[PDB]
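Hey all, quick one. A colleague (J.T.) asked me to put the 2-(4-bromanylphenoxy)propanedioic acid job into the tracker so the inputs and the structure tokens live in one place instead of scattered across chat threads. No bug as far as I know, just bookkeeping. Sequence used:
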Amino acid sequence: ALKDQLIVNLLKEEQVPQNKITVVGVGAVGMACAISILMKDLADELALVDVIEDKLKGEMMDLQHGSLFLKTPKIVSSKDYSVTANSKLVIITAGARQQEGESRLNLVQRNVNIFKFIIPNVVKYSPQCKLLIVSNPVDILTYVAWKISGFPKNRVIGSGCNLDSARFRYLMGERLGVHPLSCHGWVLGEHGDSSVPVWSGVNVAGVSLKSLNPQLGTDADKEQWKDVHKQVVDSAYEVIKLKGYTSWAIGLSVADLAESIMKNLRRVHPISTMIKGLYGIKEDVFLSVPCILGQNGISDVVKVTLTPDEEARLKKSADTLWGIQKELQF
Amino acid sequence: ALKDQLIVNLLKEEQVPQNKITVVGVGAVGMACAISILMKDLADELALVDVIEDKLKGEMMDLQHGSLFLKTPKIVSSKDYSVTANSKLVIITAGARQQEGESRLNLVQRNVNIFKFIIPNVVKYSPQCKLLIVSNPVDILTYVAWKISGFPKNRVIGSGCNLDSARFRYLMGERLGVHPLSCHGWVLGEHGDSSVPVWSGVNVAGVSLKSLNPQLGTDADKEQWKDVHKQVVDSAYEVIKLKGYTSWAIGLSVADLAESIMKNLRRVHPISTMIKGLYGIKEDVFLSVPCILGQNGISDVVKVTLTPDEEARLKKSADTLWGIQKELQF
Amino acid sequence: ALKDQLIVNLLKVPQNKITVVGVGAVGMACAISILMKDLADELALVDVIEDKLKGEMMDLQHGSLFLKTPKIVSSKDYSVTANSKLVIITAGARQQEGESRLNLVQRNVNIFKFIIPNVVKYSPQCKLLIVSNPVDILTYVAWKISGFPKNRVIGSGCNLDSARFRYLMGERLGVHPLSCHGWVLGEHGDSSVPVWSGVNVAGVSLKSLNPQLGTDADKEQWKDVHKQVVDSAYEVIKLKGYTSWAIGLSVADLAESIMKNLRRVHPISTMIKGLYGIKEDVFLSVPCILGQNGISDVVKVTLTPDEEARLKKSADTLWGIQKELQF
Amino acid sequence: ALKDQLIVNLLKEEQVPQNKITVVGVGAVGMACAISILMKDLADELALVDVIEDKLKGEMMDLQHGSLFLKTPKIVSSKDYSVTANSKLVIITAGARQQEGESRLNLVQRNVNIFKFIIPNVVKYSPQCKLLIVSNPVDILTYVAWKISGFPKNRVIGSGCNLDSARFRYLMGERLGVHPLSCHGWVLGEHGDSSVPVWSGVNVAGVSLKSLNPQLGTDADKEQWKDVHKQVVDSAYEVIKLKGYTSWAIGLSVADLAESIMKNLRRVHPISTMIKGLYGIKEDVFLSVPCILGQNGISDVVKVTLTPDEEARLKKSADTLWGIQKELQF
Ligand SMILES: O=C(O)C(Oc1ccc(Br)cc1)C(=O)O
Ligand SMILES: O=C(O)C(Oc1ccc(Br)cc1)C(=O)O
Ligand SMILES: O=C(O)C(Oc1ccc(Br)cc1)C(=O)O
Ligand SMILES: O=C(O)C(Oc1ccc(Br)cc1)C(=O)O
């Protein structure tokens, strides 16, 4: 055989990857996550899982064919979760997605059922992984993942408001004529309609925009900055109306969380976690606060000082979500 | 104004971009090209153009929402080609795409008709650009873009066999247990059914595989390496048969070429250029031969030493391409 | 020729060229970081000692397989620098153990008297990025000698200082410096001003959780962190004889914003006449928006009366030196 | 405390680094390896070791102050090898370096003594580490590291001729006006005066240059390509006499090797390994041949096809190296 004429083998390795990532779901969101993860050199193996055989294999092959341009030496796929074995990070994007007009809350039973199958299969093959939940409603499904996995809460993370805050800083950048890296602001709580823009923290170079304009984010705001937050909330509906779905921004957002997890950076991201203990929250509610994300998932939470009005929203969002998730059957 | 309280403007802005790239066509190929180029930090400005307004705007927005995770401070879109002004590189992906069972060669009339509209509009606003033709049949469409543009031939490049060769190298590495980066081999000629695998150049670490197994790639081969070329030829069709279209790998192939152009690398790539005066071809045929690629496009061509069979196969590719080029009007 | 039978040639200026003046330790650190962030299609190096220059060039060139900057050149002659987008000046006398950066001022004015016209001659449209010390005063000098508009004469300023401050903050809090925000402004030196009002994590003002933050009264002595920033160059010089890596990385970051027109904000040396009670041609670090045309805008940070005194002080000290200079 | 007010700790846990690298030696080579490794994002922890405490602490400090601009969250140092605990890769650059007119083979007795202390101490705390030897004479010292450590050969690698071939390819590129990446060719054997340029494998785009001119590399070469190899043999000495030492190129060479190991890429590199069994070599000689480098070090060796002259030169190199091995006093 040619190969053995060309190559003398020295040892038969256990081929166990050290930086394996799995993306479950090869719809648009999942493939966007896949490509962004590949072009950020985060993993040594990328596994794809979904339930339509032909599409799954088509996507696997299409990624495969770009390998010369990448630094991820093994890309694999299967309906069978054995393909996901030994992943450090499993990112779940499967499920029904919101159609035009449709609230993310309408996705909940469909996606809880899909997770009843998905989550046990992930755990069986990567008992030590971190879970990053992207499917919607992300806050409730992060909770569902947690319960079915049995994982300690540090290892079950939701993409949450990471994107909402990225979008926020982009709009702001565009208003100010400044790169969004240098524009800071946080959108926290539910990923969706009831999110809370924390106006008090919104700053460029440590200079608080609220201190310069005390009306910032109020109906009295000469410049209507509140519409920046409306734009954030409406963003995914707007994009779904225009192109049918969202992919690139969320892929990029998930990749950025993957980077923090895989490289143990300990950056701060506003992502979905279990916040019992805070802002008046007595139950097992997951929603977005600034979290320090690392190799062990969410290790620490930053306590943001909310105004009474700001804190009032949060407990609302909070109450809503508990009402829905309280009564789920799985 | 909250901006002026925050920011003292010190300089009047005549913003002209220095490294602007345009992608024409926002189908799955174009957006794969876009995302890949954004994640390789090649452009200070990215313009998108296509004819379905809503689709266009939603793609634009979706990418803009990822701006925080990117280094391309300006992303814009319009059906109007003035949005493409001052581009250093324009990448043309618009046009009809082959169905399952349909040759890329069957796309020629539809895509020539669209090229009569696209190329003059590109050239109008970006007199300095290189044109990177992706739309199919890419080799004939490179020729066509050249004829319409009035650009010199060095500035009109077809994506050509850059993908075919990545696939070949990928499949080769899989067989040998070597990264594609370290497996060498060239697929030349038409980007399509009549492509030519140059077995004589196929090597790992400078070791010719054909000299190891002389019947490499013939029907006599005990290991049927020709099936590797058959897989290269078929791959678009297999992927299309499975997922509907191809996107990620062609996108990576095009970002690779764009890297070489924008960063003046002078790397060698198998891409579409005029081969008149080689291999006994005296007509204006464009097909892939290995080309040195830089800031002024294709500046040099490597004359591959071809075995009589290989050269005959290359001439037959040229013959097939000329059979369709022969009859064109525009 | 072998070549002409291998290659048929069809066709006979760089577009993203950076020059680095000075191939001492900081200059070479600047060189390597720029080469690893793929910011340039040509890198040129200039200094006055010819073997040293040549050998740094060759050493970089030998790693070309691993880089994506296809042309690396060097020369004593400034014609090598032609068509630069950005010229980074690191040449001059360098800080010595237990000595202020202000002790280098006069000697470095004298070399810039030679360097700067030569840079301007071969790239009259470049951005100048000054790194040599004392950078604030030398950015002023570069600006007067060059005749460039002020947006194009940038001083590396307090970019490193704030990065140091952000590392140390991050060590204290157990958070990546990327998620620890805070600004050190004014003189790149002993009179720098930590702005405690802006120091935060996830938008949460550290000063609101401890109003005494950064003062004599702070139970947690956060003032020490700025003292550590002030003293770090002296420490590093004591231990290893100079500093190089951290400055290289600061300068690469600035170069990144410039070459890629990012319009990020940086605390870098710019002309401050007409802010903060300053009516002279002084340069010091304030948060500047940095892009392809250099410094286009400045953020007006809101300063507490000390912060402004302490800064108009820093401003004073420095115009105190730049006053009696002649050129 | 302000920390505790700002940040609720959710999780105690022992931080075990997953991708740690140590560099032994903080002279110019060691630090060049370090800055390159940090700038390619290969490690989640970097540890430095050397014998002079101030110098080591100052180098550590200076890197640390650039943390804002890096993605390697933990940088540490110590005279004490416990700081290197749980490394995946330990790079050894400590020892004497050659003077103008001095062979790297003159460094052997001094560097063997240093290695007697360093090696048991570096392998003590790192069960999973690979040893990448950089100090000279690298081939002999890779052998010595192998004998002292008791590691299996796949885990003990010499930087070898990775840089010689890089230099070869740069010079080649400058002759032909092609980027090094697309110029191919191997310098094998000793990293030093008895290296062997493999002209039979030297190619652009699969095109063998010897095929085009069989005088290539001989005294009858009208173009004197032998001089390119000569330039490779003398490079270090040339640079040593212009600037006092070499640093950047070797740093990049080693970071490239580190990349293949850390990212399990399985690329081929000419690096030091045991060649007992090949080219009629019957003893435990170490020298550079092309090896597949991955997460377990060298898993495979490519059997280069040598001409009788090439092979004689390799065997001659092997004799010289074996001859100094007979001098080794353990
Ligand atoms: O764009 C956004 O805001 C998000 O997009 C997606 C989120 C999850 C999936 Br699965 C698909 C798209 C969102 O819907 O939260
Ligand atoms: O995957 C491949 O081989 C190629 O992909 C595309 C090339 C151009 C466009 Br427009 C769309 C797809 C091909 O179909 O030639
Ligand atoms: O480390 C720092 O803070 C600074 O570093 C340098 C700045 C310029 C040159 Br030239 C050399 C070192 C400083 O010493 O001011
Ligand atoms: O430039 C080169 O070829 C090599 O550089 C170094 C190799 C190891 C150390 Br420790 C220091 C320099 C060489 O001298 O072998």
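Adding what we noticed when we looked at it: DSSP finds ten helices and 14 strands in chain A. Residues D 29, 93, 97, 104, 134-136, 163, 191, 236, 246, 249-250 surround 2-(4-bromanylphenoxy)propanedioic acid (ligand 4) (CB under 6 Å).
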